[PDB]
Scaffold this active site. Sequence first.
Site, PDB file in Angstrom:
ATOM      1  NE  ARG B 168      -4.122  -1.934   2.239  1.00  0.00           N
ATOM      2  CZ  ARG B 168      -4.655  -2.671   3.208  1.00  0.00           C
ATOM      3  NH1 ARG B 168      -4.044  -2.757   4.387  1.00  0.00           N
ATOM      4  NH2 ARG B 168      -5.784  -3.347   2.997  1.00  0.00           N
ATOM      5  CG  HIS B 192      -1.340  -6.067   9.317  1.00  0.00           C
ATOM      6  ND1 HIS B 192      -1.218  -5.370   8.134  1.00  0.00           N
ATOM      7  CD2 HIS B 192      -2.611  -6.543   9.346  1.00  0.00           C
ATOM      8  CE1 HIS B 192      -2.356  -5.442   7.462  1.00  0.00           C
ATOM      9  NE2 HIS B 192      -3.220  -6.140   8.181  1.00  0.00           N
TER      10      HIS B 192
HETATM   11  N1  NAI Z   1      -3.435  -9.936   7.581  1.00  0.00           N
HETATM   12  C1  NAI Z   1      -4.212  -9.047   6.784  1.00  0.00           C
HETATM   13  O1  NAI Z   1      -3.665  -8.109   6.167  1.00  0.00           O
HETATM   14  C2  NAI Z   1      -5.702  -9.210   6.675  1.00  0.00           C
HETATM   15  C3  NAI Z   1      -6.377 -10.054   7.552  1.00  0.00           C
HETATM   16  N2  NAI Z   1      -7.729 -10.219   7.492  1.00  0.00           N
HETATM   17  C4  NAI Z   1      -8.360 -11.138   8.445  1.00  0.00           C
HETATM   18  O2  NAI Z   1      -8.684 -12.368   7.857  1.00  0.00           O
HETATM   19  C5  NAI Z   1      -9.773 -12.949   8.642  1.00  0.00           C
HETATM   20  C6  NAI Z   1     -10.845 -13.333   7.758  1.00  0.00           C
HETATM   21  O3  NAI Z   1     -11.482 -12.305   7.066  1.00  0.00           O
HETATM   22  P1  NAI Z   1     -12.693 -12.616   6.085  1.00  0.00           P
HETATM   23  O4  NAI Z   1     -12.284 -13.808   5.209  1.00  0.00           O
HETATM   24  O5  NAI Z   1     -13.067 -11.323   5.417  1.00  0.00           O
HETATM   25  O6  NAI Z   1     -13.851 -13.120   7.052  1.00  0.00           O
HETATM   26  P2  NAI Z   1     -15.079 -14.019   6.563  1.00  0.00           P
HETATM   27  O7  NAI Z   1     -16.126 -13.776   7.618  1.00  0.00           O
HETATM   28  O8  NAI Z   1     -15.544 -13.700   5.161  1.00  0.00           O
HETATM   29  O9  NAI Z   1     -14.614 -15.505   6.588  1.00  0.00           O
HETATM   30  C7  NAI Z   1     -14.179 -16.156   7.720  1.00  0.00           C
HETATM   31  C8  NAI Z   1     -14.256 -17.605   7.649  1.00  0.00           C
HETATM   32  O10 NAI Z   1     -13.599 -18.182   8.752  1.00  0.00           O
HETATM   33  C9  NAI Z   1     -14.361 -19.315   9.017  1.00  0.00           C
HETATM   34  N3  NAI Z   1     -14.094 -19.921  10.303  1.00  0.00           N
HETATM   35  C10 NAI Z   1     -14.476 -19.457  11.504  1.00  0.00           C
HETATM   36  N4  NAI Z   1     -14.064 -20.322  12.465  1.00  0.00           N
HETATM   37  C11 NAI Z   1     -13.423 -21.343  11.865  1.00  0.00           C
HETATM   38  C12 NAI Z   1     -12.794 -22.515  12.281  1.00  0.00           C
HETATM   39  N5  NAI Z   1     -12.720 -22.865  13.689  1.00  0.00           N
HETATM   40  N6  NAI Z   1     -12.228 -23.333  11.377  1.00  0.00           N
HETATM   41  C13 NAI Z   1     -12.267 -23.052  10.063  1.00  0.00           C
HETATM   42  N7  NAI Z   1     -12.867 -21.945   9.623  1.00  0.00           N
HETATM   43  C14 NAI Z   1     -13.448 -21.090  10.486  1.00  0.00           C
HETATM   44  C15 NAI Z   1     -15.763 -18.802   8.898  1.00  0.00           C
HETATM   45  O11 NAI Z   1     -16.679 -19.854   8.881  1.00  0.00           O
HETATM   46  C16 NAI Z   1     -15.688 -18.022   7.720  1.00  0.00           C
HETATM   47  O12 NAI Z   1     -16.054 -18.750   6.585  1.00  0.00           O
HETATM   48  C17 NAI Z   1     -10.175 -11.893   9.596  1.00  0.00           C
HETATM   49  O13 NAI Z   1      -9.547 -12.127  10.818  1.00  0.00           O
HETATM   50  C18 NAI Z   1      -9.672 -10.652   8.982  1.00  0.00           C
HETATM   51  O14 NAI Z   1      -9.587  -9.619   9.866  1.00  0.00           O
HETATM   52  C19 NAI Z   1      -8.462  -9.551   6.542  1.00  0.00           C
HETATM   53  C20 NAI Z   1      -7.822  -8.692   5.627  1.00  0.00           C
HETATM   54  C21 NAI Z   1      -6.430  -8.501   5.696  1.00  0.00           C
END
Ligand code: NAI
Lengths: 326, 331, 331, 331
Positions: B168, B192
């Site tokens: 970014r 981050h």
């Molecule tokens: N490191 C980075 O730069 C970034 C990190 N993130 C993080 O990534 C994570 C996911 O974001 P999104 O995909 O948008 O959320 P999302 O809500 O679209 O998807 C999350 C998925 O995790 C699944 N999940 C929950 N518990 C679980 C388990 N015990 N085992 C397997 N799957 C499980 C859910 O069922 C869901 O499908 C968040 O923590 C978010 O903040 C998001 C953007 C950037």
Amino acid sequence: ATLKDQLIYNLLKEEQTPQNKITVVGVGAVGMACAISILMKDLADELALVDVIEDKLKGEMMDLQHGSLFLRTPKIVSGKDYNVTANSKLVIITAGARSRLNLVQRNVNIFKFIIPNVVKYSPNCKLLIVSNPVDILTYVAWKISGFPKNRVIGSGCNLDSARFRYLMGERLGVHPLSCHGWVLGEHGDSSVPVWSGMNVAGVSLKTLHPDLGTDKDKEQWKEVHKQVVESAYEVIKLKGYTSWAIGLSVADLAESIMKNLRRVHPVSTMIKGLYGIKDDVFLSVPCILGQNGISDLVKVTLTSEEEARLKKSADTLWGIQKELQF
Amino acid sequence: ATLKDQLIYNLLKEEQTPQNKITVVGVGAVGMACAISILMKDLADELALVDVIEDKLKGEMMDLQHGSLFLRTPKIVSGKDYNVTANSKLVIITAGARQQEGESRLNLVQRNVNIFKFIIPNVVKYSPNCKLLIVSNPVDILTYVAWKISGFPKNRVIGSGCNLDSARFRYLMGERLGVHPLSCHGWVLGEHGDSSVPVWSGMNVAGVSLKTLHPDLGTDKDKEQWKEVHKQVVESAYEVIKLKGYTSWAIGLSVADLAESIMKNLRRVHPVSTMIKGLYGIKDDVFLSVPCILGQNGISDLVKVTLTSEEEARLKKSADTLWGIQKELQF
Amino acid sequence: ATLKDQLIYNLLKEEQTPQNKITVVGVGAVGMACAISILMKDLADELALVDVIEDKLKGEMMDLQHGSLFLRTPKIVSGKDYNVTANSKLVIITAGARQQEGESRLNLVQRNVNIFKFIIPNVVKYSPNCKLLIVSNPVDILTYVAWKISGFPKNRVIGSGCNLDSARFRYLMGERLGVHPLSCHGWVLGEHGDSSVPVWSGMNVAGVSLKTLHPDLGTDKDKEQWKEVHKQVVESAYEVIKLKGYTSWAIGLSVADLAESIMKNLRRVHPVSTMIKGLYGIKDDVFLSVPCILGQNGISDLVKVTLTSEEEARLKKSADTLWGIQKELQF
Amino acid sequence: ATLKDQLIYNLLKEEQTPQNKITVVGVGAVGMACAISILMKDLADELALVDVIEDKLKGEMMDLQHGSLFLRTPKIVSGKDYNVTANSKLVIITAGARQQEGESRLNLVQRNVNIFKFIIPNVVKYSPNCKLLIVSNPVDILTYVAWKISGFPKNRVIGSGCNLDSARFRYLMGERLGVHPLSCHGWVLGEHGDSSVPVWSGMNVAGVSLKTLHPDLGTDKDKEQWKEVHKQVVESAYEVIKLKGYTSWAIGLSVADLAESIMKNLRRVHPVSTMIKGLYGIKDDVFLSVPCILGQNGISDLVKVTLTSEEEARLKKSADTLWGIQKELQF
Ligand SMILES: NC(=O)C1=CN([C@@H]2O[C@H](COP(=O)(O)OP(=O)(O)OC[C@H]3O[C@@H](n4cnc5c(N)ncnc54)[C@H](O)[C@@H]3O)[C@@H](O)[C@H]2O)C=CC1
Ligand SMILES: NC(=O)C1=CN([C@@H]2O[C@H](COP(=O)(O)OP(=O)(O)OC[C@H]3O[C@@H](n4cnc5c(N)ncnc54)[C@H](O)[C@@H]3O)[C@@H](O)[C@H]2O)C=CC1
Ligand SMILES: NC(=O)C1=CN([C@@H]2O[C@H](COP(=O)(O)OP(=O)(O)OC[C@H]3O[C@@H](n4cnc5c(N)ncnc54)[C@H](O)[C@@H]3O)[C@@H](O)[C@H]2O)C=CC1
Ligand SMILES: NC(=O)C1=CN([C@@H]2O[C@H](COP(=O)(O)OP(=O)(O)OC[C@H]3O[C@@H](n4cnc5c(N)ncnc54)[C@H](O)[C@@H]3O)[C@@H](O)[C@H]2O)C=CC1
Ligand SMILES: C[C@@H](Sc1nc(-c2ccc(Cl)c(Cl)c2)c(C#N)c(=O)[nH]1)C(=O)Nc1ccc(S(N)(=O)=O)cc1
Ligand SMILES: C[C@@H](Sc1nc(-c2ccc(Cl)c(Cl)c2)c(C#N)c(=O)[nH]1)C(=O)Nc1ccc(S(N)(=O)=O)cc1
Ligand SMILES: C[C@@H](Sc1nc(-c2ccc(Cl)c(Cl)c2)c(C#N)c(=O)[nH]1)C(=O)Nc1ccc(S(N)(=O)=O)cc1
């Protein structure tokens, strides 16, 4: 002076009209899958996104832009106004809603606004229609745009044929690239699997296995095409919509168009003249795709039953089409 | 004789393991962006997907499978059971809660640590030699957690960290300078999150130091207010979340960038979350981003950035903040 | 009722003008290596080859064509006549004469001038708006020659210059540090070949300046003899020629990288030869390598690198030598 | 400490074997074309070159290395000693003699058998579990020789065979029809070169059989003389050699395509030379091209093409001829 001016001496201040620009209209699940797939294949030197939901549109644009370091598409723009789409070589329409007739009319009302705006800013682009019902909407975009038929393409059965080849490869234990088979006619429910052309290394399965795709087939290969139809519904039921496969399919079409490859794809095209069809309808047949859109099409030899099915589709499509309000 | 048998003569059967298997855990917005990016980069011969929402999982798997003709990854599988993940070279964790508009990534700790307590041991059981790439937020804390739970050596536990923040930053730098981000070099280190640190002293184009050309660069006195560029990097996730609800595409591409260096043993340098004990008088087992050499054994080396007194203070502040959180975790 | 007509229905026969055409002039080892690299990077929708050796030319064209199934460039043409090169976006010149034992620099340059006097007007005739990329040696002088003959604006005449020297430098740097060359940054500027200048101040990994860590870097007091890295850049070119008779692969790959920035309008920064009058201290019409922003208009901008007194003197001396030769040339 | 130690803190020393290593034996025009195409397709994490001409080998290696900045293959090695080839997944043999004036064809064959007598044992010693891809001519005979000498199972010994012939056929088909070769389907099987068999029944676009549309296809009574297309496939091989002296680009690209399926376990079908004993009434240990499924363990399956009586008799004749030669070779 500025740090920029201290760092950089300018020889000339641009700027050329866009050279390899693609526009995607509608940044829902399908539009964004098309966008990312097009970006990762380095097909465009400029990508423009349009939608009516302004915050969504801006956020999607920004998300992509933040990944610029990892891409080779140096300009990504977006806007509700079509001025951002000026001089696109290719304009992909994924906008719309996802009874039936009133739905078609809703998407037609949408096209009445979109298509004239597209034409105003890129009068010489190719239009690639993805919105459903795709065959009907490709005809609508054709009539509204006033474009010649070579420049109006429906994604049609490209996806259906990809599904079919995926399923065939699973059955045979061979990569889909090496498993050849064509699904033609209407996208979705009424598509037609052309059993005579299903082959690996030029070896016709129908010649090896005469019962191929018939009711009496001990192996019920007809179920493969059944799955092609049903799997579309199952994916929607399971995740709520489809995105990745159609995005990849569309990027494949875009690749042939942008790079003037002249590969053959099953896409929706004006088929008046073929198979006893005498109405302005669009159905998928194998088309040669290049810089001028559809320049040629393959005349597939169809059985009596196969021709009848296409004819029945044409009649149905025309029936709907002649009632649409433009 | 079946059609298959008529058509194809088999020389030998019996299965073989995949050579370059990647698993993605969590098939939400982030997991699927990672999946598509990795697939389109041809990094894996097998992709496995895991989630706890079974219909969503199957649907996402099928959608990718239907795109097989256009890919070079011949096997895509999924399951709630971790047996589908066996023999993975790289396991990417994206599962868990995401921050809503106006919410800090640090507000997600309890939720996501608890999820990791279930996930990580399962991952390790089925792929004891994999590299772990953590993406879930807050990513630095969860990399520490993954490392502690897994019992892996720290070289094999990597946080996506500031690879995205630096991307970014370089995007914004390139817009200001009229140069592609690839040619604009500048590093964002530390958390981050809100406490990340722009390394002004190292910013350059073609090896020409911007700080040398422009001594006020990054400071409050800066007439061009370059510090606003870093402020934009800090605020970027919040802005995108406000607009579209979540971020996905940029992190997907960032993760595929990291996966490529690991899977292909490139030994390229990326700022990723890792243990920085021993750098800058930091004594705690804190995880945050510094430039690392990435390859087939994960993080093999750290590059030691010389920070100004001011940059080093900010980095130490980021470490202090994150360790305050990590130290209270219970395993 | 030909098989083609039975099989294919034609909707229209129209236009068919190449949108992203590249021409390579000269199909020796360098030209064909540029050709294969450009093909394998999917940069062009049409490739045209020109040479004066007709059999060789047709053979090379056919050999590439027979590989069409594996490429995404649908039209490959060749001919001694320049009509095959019409409407090229980019025209790459590798043609020229090789220096004879005992032949003076002036005599060699003059022979190449005479060769360019046939080539360039024909290129301009058929692609009046193309960018010219000169690879032929001596590249800095012949870039000037092509500029003079073509009458093109400065931005559209580009010498491959020190692009290859810098790539070699970064390979060698990478080998010493155990880091991928992508992540080792360093710039070799000025004259291609023997008199090139390694800019020690810009050599860095992750923005960490090697010269700042190691102040003796590049000097005779350097116990690690980093100066030997640049000596190898200079000598490795001769060594490859002695070993295999010529160089091809690395130059091909470097030229393809330049073509990528130009064709895709990337605005990446590369060390290439550009008309340097009025900058870095110089007052004659001479071309030397500095970091240049490359895109669809050729060189749109260049970077002004801060040089040491010694580095500046070396560029100035090169300029004096080049102009000394150029002013005696007969056009 | 050293500059390296000031710059880089090491976590891990312990290196690991390359996991996707390819070796090319013979660095003539064919070998180096295979090399550059493999490098540009990112198939390998280490590339080894072997030849007996030491200066040429070293120069080719260095030339490739100097291009590393533009590649994603972090290690390129070369040596006369086969220890440089250890742990290769795929070993490609392009080594061969050149027929001399007055020399008989059988004599040339035996000279290449003698070359393989030295090469193959060495390859097997350092990569006992590799797949062998034979390109050296006569390719069908030498694939048998490599199989016999190596003692490898038939799935791990693969001759390039009619892969190139088929690519040429599709190129020519595509020109006649105005369609990309990717969409023009047709198979040339049996012997590489003069005695190859065009399988007319399989020629199609979009699954539409040309033979059904045009029954005279491939016969002498063919008003359009499509037989001339196969005639050009064989003739063009000699013409390229006559015009440019050898063939390189097309074979190199076709070999990289085979390597891609093997290295990425794609299970695509390619026309390659394989043990056909038990097919078409053939009862001798002979290798001929038929469509084969290629993946991680080489040829796992082959497609049993339905052939006409005339087509079956051509393969049988070829097998008889090849066996007659093979039984007289000195091992
Ligand atoms: N490191 C980075 O730069 C970034 C990190 N993130 C993080 O990534 C994570 C996911 O974001 P999104 O995909 O948008 O959320 P999302 O809500 O679209 O998807 C999350 C998925 O995790 C699944 N999940 C929950 N518990 C679980 C388990 N015990 N085992 C397997 N799957 C499980 C859910 O069922 C869901 O499908 C968040 O923590 C978010 O903040 C998001 C953007 C950037
Ligand atoms: N041809 C094919 O094979 C496939 C077609 N589709 C179709 O693609 C279309 C979109 O699908 P999704 O992305 O899942 O729907 P979506 O609801 O997620 O996205 C649709 C987008 O269109 C936008 N839109 C609506 N009116 C607009 C206007 N006047 N101008 C610009 N944008 C406008 C919406 O705001 C929305 O963002 C549907 O018609 C769907 O049926 C979906 C899968 C496959
Ligand atoms: N700038 C750089 O970093 C490098 C530049 N080079 C230069 O590239 C040039 C070419 O190298 P090679 O391919 O090895 O030489 P080469 O002798 O093998 O090929 C040169 C080709 O130019 C052709 N040619 C001669 N006159 C012509 C004319 N009037 N029109 C069209 N074609 C003509 C020749 O017939 C020949 O095929 C050399 O001058 C060489 O020094 C080589 C390596 C690196
Ligand atoms: N299968 C196919 O479709 C095609 C096959 N070929 C064949 O590929 C082979 C090579 O072609 P070129 O590269 O043009 O020949 P080349 O003569 O230019 O190169 C052959 C290399 O093999 C090396 N070599 C000889 N003995 C060796 C040994 N004991 N160990 C290691 N290296 C050794 C030579 O030193 C030489 O460098 C030829 O046999 C040719 O007929 C050529 C074109 C197509
Ligand atoms: C498999 C479903 S899945 C599906 N179908 C529809 C759909 C398709 C056609 C109609 Cl008429 C309606 Cl009302 C809905 C939408 C949508 N929207 C959607 O999001 N998904 C589908 O696409 N059916 C389909 C049927 C006919 C046509 S055609 N030949 O009339 O153009 C096109 C598509
Ligand atoms: C490393 C050699 S390798 C090499 N060099 C030459 C060469 C270069 C310059 C001159 Cl003046 C001459 Cl006579 C020959 C030829 C050639 N031909 C060749 O085939 N290979 C080289 O390219 N030297 C070089 C020296 C000066 C210039 S410049 N700044 O005057 O443009 C450019 C290149
Ligand atoms: C078209 C020529 S072009 C060509 N041919 C040869 C060649 C091929 C076969 C023989 Cl027996 C001999 Cl002595 C030379 C060389 C070589 N070397 C060369 O460099 N180019 C060719 O490859 N012929 C060919 C004939 C038979 C076989 S097989 N089925 O017996 O293995 C393989 C190839």
